[PDB]
């Protein structure tokens, strides 16, 4: 019985594919990290038909659902137990997230305290 958020609206994303850097498929030195094309003759920059799209501001997501995980919560990185009383009073809207650097003996304690406090943990059985 997973914990539920206060409300779970239907999250709508205007795009699910990522904006890949132009011509990154033809080279290995070119990562897919988006760089704006600035060439004088660049058809991608000139917005020709059937080319790679560019990240307009019109793709911005709804503010009511922005950053919402598919579970309906919003993530918060926590490093120790004392940072869970922070989410104590944001119980139904915000979940917890244990850092990769925390060791197993402390992850057990964080998970136990969160279970006591009814705060959701997105990676509760990570290391064991």
């Amino acid at each position: 019985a997973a914990l539920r958020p206060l409300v779970k609206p239907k999250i709508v994303k205007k795009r699910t594919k990522k904006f890949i850097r132009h011509q990154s498929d033809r080279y290995v030195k070119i990562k897919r990290n988006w760089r704006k094309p600035r060439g004088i003759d660049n058809r991608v920059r000139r917005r020709f038909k059937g080319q790679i799209l560019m990240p307009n501001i019109g793709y911005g997501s709804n503010k009511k659902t922005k950053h919402m995980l598919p579970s309906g919560f919003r993530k918060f990185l926590v490093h120790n137990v004392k940072e869970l009383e922070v989410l104590l009073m944001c119980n139904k809207s915000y979940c917890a997230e244990i850092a990769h650097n925390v060791s197993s003996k402390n992850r057990k304690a964080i998970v136990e305290r969160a279970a006591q406090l009814a705060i959701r943990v997105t990676n509760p059985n990570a290391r064991l």
């Binding site: 206060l6 409300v7 119980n91 139904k92």
Partner: protein, 215 residues
């Protein structure tokens, strides 16, 4: 005072037939002018106590939703106005199109309070029992039965027909079906070949176009 039926006949929806002062005259408002708990004491065995019929909540959630802006035209399903196609009248022959009885000609009896048609079907003819169907998923053929001289028991309704929870046929259902079917069979035996038509199954063959054939 004893209530009276509305004195303003409707012309169309929302428009009464008579004017404002015409209704004033009809109501005769000229001669009707007018002018200007919480706690109960429950005895106890030192003195008496005051009991609270309402107790404050013992737990408050972390957060709660605000109230909703309230609209006007939205109603529960129980009281929507229910409509029926003109081609469907009691006694017409329908064609079932969705369920396990798809394509079987049947007989229409009445429309229930939930808007679902009450179909009988003769068990001796096509093994269709007293069943509900949806008005949309049927075809109304142009064949009628003089069913007006048939009485359907009142007790059978949507509450009767609704699913309860392996399914066993009850004796109440069997006797209700026996009564209705014994009432309906002779009236359709009076139309030649009608029993065979009801027993057959409708289907589409080569070159037969639904938009060209009069049903």
């Amino acid at each position: 005072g004893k209530p009276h039926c509305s004195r303003n006949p409707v012309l169309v929806r929302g428009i009464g037939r008579y004017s404002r002062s015409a209704m004033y005259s009809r109501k005769a408002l000229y001669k009707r002018k007018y002018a200007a708990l919480a706690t109960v004491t429950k005895p106890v065995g030192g003195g008496t106590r005051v009991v609270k019929l309402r107790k404050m909540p013992r737990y408050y959630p972390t957060e709660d939703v605000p109230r909703k802006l309230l609209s006007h035209g939205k109603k529960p399903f129980s009281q929507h106005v229910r409509k029926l196609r003109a081609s469907i009248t009691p006694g017409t022959i329908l064609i079932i199109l969705t369920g396990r009885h798809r394509g079987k000609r049947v007989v229409f009896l009445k429309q229930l309070s939930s808007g679902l048609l009450l179909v009988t079907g003769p068990l001796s003819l096509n093994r269709v029992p007293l069943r509900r169907t949806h008005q949309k998923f049927v075809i109304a053929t142009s064949t009628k039965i003089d069913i007006s001289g048939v009485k359907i028991p009142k007790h059978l309704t949507d509450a009767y027909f609704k699913k309860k929870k392996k399914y066993e046929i009850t004796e109440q259902r069997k006797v209700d079906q026996k009564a209705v079917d014994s009432q309906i069979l002779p009236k359709i035996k009076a139309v030649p070949q009608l029993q065979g038509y009801l027993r057959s199954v409708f289907a589409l063959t080569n070159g037969v176009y639904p938009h060209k054939l009069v049903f």
